[PDB]
Design brief:
The PDB classes it as calcium/phospholipid binding. With about 325 residues, the chain is mainly α. It has four domains: about 70 residues, Annexin V, domain 1; about 70 residues, Annexin V, domain 1, CATH 1.10.220.10; about 90 residues, Annexin V, domain 1 (Orthogonal Bundle), CATH 1.10.220.10; about 70 residues, Annexin V, domain 1, CATH 1.10.220. It contains 20 helices and no strands. Bound molecules: calcium ion (5 copies).
Length: about 325
C-alpha cells in the first residue's frame, strides 16, 4: 500500500558523490544540473552519508556550501531535501510558530495528516531539537477551540481499530449532524472529542452514517475551504481520515491553482512525502483532478527548481 517516488540509489558511493558535488561547486560558477540530478536520485539517508563524506574528505560543510552557491526557490528546495527526514516536519512546525503571528496552514496540515506514530516521533524530536515542548509552543500561539483540537490531536491517542460499536456510530453520526446544521459553532467540546479521539475505522462508518442522515457528505457542511481556523482543521482531519494521500494531493492542487504558486507548500509536500506515499498522492491527484501532478508542476514552475521537482515527482 504506501509507495514513495525516491528510493536508495543502488551502487551508492558517498565519497564519489561528495567529489562530484565539490567539483560542481568549486571555483567561479556552479553546476546546478549536476547537483539537482544527483541529489534527487539519492534517498535522504544517502544525502546524510554524502554530507558526512564531504566533511571527512574536505573539512567543509556541504549545506553551507549549497546555500552560498544556490539561490531562490532552487536553494529552498535543495536545503529542504538535505534536512534529515526525522527532523523535517519538526522544523516546519517550529517555523510556523516562531515569530509574530503563526502559520496556521502548516500547523493544520501536518498535525491533521500525520499518524499518531509520526506525531510521537515529531514531539520527541522537537523537544530535543528546540528545547521546548511542541504542545507548549502550540498553546502559546493558538487560541480557542482551534488550540484545543490541536492539543487533542497532539496527544496521539486515537482509539484502536477494533470493536465497531454501531450504537456509538449512530450516536456520533447524529451529533455531527446536529453540529453541522449549527455550522460547527455550538457543541464544540462534543464534536472535538469525536473527531480527535475515535478510531479511523469508527469515523469512516460515522461519515457514511452522516451521509445517509443528511443526504450529503460532511465536508459539504464544513465546506468553506477558506476562513476560520477550526473549520479548516475539521476539513483537514475529515479528508485525512478518508485518505491522507488524497488530502495531500488536494493541498498540492490548490498550491498551483490561480495566479501564483504556493511554493512553500509545494516543496514541503514534495520533499516530506517523497519516501512515504508520494506515488499514492500522484495516483490520487490524477484520479480526482484529471491531470497528472507532473504536468501541473511543469506548467507552474520554472528553471532548475522545475527540473528538480519534476525528478522528485
Ligand atoms: Ca563556485
Ligand atoms: Ca551555472
Ligand atoms: Ca551559483
Ligand atoms: Ca508565533
Ligand atoms: Ca498558479
Amino acid at each position: 500500500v504506501l509507495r514513495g517516488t525516491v528510493t536508495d540509489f543502488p551502487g551508492f558511493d558517498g565519497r564519489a558523490d561528495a567529489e562530484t558535488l565539490r567539483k560542481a561547486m568549486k571555483g567561479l560558477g556552479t553546476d546546478e544540473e549536476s547537483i539537482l540530478t544527483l541529489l534527487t536520485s539519492r534517498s535522504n539517508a544517502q544525502r546524510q552519508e554524502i554530507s558526512a563524506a564531504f566533511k571527512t574528505l574536505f573539512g567543509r560543510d556541504l549545506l553551507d556550501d549549497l546555500k552560498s552557491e544556490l539561490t531562490g526557490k532552487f536553494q529552498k528546495l535543495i536545503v529542504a531535501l538535505m534536512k534529515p527526514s526525522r527532523l523535517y516536519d519538526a522544523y516546519e512546525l517550529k517555523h510556523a510558530l516562531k515569530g509574530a503571528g503563526t502559520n496556521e496552514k502548516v500547523l493544520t496540515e501536518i498535525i491533521a495528516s500525520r499518524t499518531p506514530e509520526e506525531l510521537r516521533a515529531i514531539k520527541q524530536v522537537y523537544e530535543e531539537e528546540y528545547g521546548s515542548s511542541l504542545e507548549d509552543d502550540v498553546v502559546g500561539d493558538t487560541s480557542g477551540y482551534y488550540q484545543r483540537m490541536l492539543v487533542v490531536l497532539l496527544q496521539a491517542n486515537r482509539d484502536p481499530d477494533a470493536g465497531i460499536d454501531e450504537a456509538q456510530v449512530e450516536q456520533d453520526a447524529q451529533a455531527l449532524f446536529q453540529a453541522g446544521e449549527l455550522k460547527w459553532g455550538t457543541d464544540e467540546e462534543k464534536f472535538i472529542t469525536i473527531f480527535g479521539t475515535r478510531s479511523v475505522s469508527h469515523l469512516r462508518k460515522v461519515f457514511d452514517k452522516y451521509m445517509t442522515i443528511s443526504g450529503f457528505q460532511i465536508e459539504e457542511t464544513i465546506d468553506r475551504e477558506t476562513s476560520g481556523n477550526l473549520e479548516q482543521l475539521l476539513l483537514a482531519v475529515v479528508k485525512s481520515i478518508r485518505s491522507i494521500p488524497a488530502y495531500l494531493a488536494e493541498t498540492l492542487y490548490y498550491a498551483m491553482k490561480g495566479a501564483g504558486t504556493d511554493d512553500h507548500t509545494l516543496i514541503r509536500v514534495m520533499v516530506s512525502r517523497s519516501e512515504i506515499d508520494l506515488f499514492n498522492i500522484r495516483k490520487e491527484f490524477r484520479k480526482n483532478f484529471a491531470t497528472s501532478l507532473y504536468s501541473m508542476i511543469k506548467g507552474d514552475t520554472s528553471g532548475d527548481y522545475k527540473k528538480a521537482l519534476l525528478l522528485l515527482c
